[PDB]
Every structure is written in C-alpha cells, then in structure tokens.
C-alpha cells in the first residue's frame, strides 16, 4: 500500500519538515518574548 519504499521518502520528508516546523513556531513565539 501507500508508503512502501517510494512514497516513504515523500511522507517521511513531511515529518522531516513538519516536525521541524513546530520547532520554528516555538523559537518564533519565544522570539516575540525577547528580541
């Protein structure tokens, strides 16, 4: 099915960025507390 080896690289690439995106929102929201 979906994500067998090919779509794995695509779907994984999501977390690699999306999971990293929440990290920015944190550093961002804190940057609005001391810039």
* Length of the chain as a residue count: 35
Residue with tokens 């990293």: 20
Contact status, residue 10 vs residue 18, Cβ threshold 8 Å: no
Q: Cβ neighbours of residue 3 under 8 Å, at least 6 residues apart?
A: 10, 11
Q: How far apart are CA 32 and CA 3, in angstroms?
A: 39
Distance (Å, whole) CA 10 – CA 18: 12
Experimental technique used to determine this entry: NMR
Helix (H, G, I), strand (E, B) or coil at 29: helix
Kindly state the greatest CA–CA separation across the chain.
47
Task: Report yes or no: 11 and 3 within 8 Å, Cβ to Cβ.
Answer: yes
């Amino acid at each position: 099915l979906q994500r067998m080896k090919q779509l794995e690289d695509k779907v994984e690439e999501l977390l690699s960025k999306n999971y990293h995106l929440e990290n920015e929102v944190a550093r961002l929201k804190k940057l609005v507390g001391e810039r």
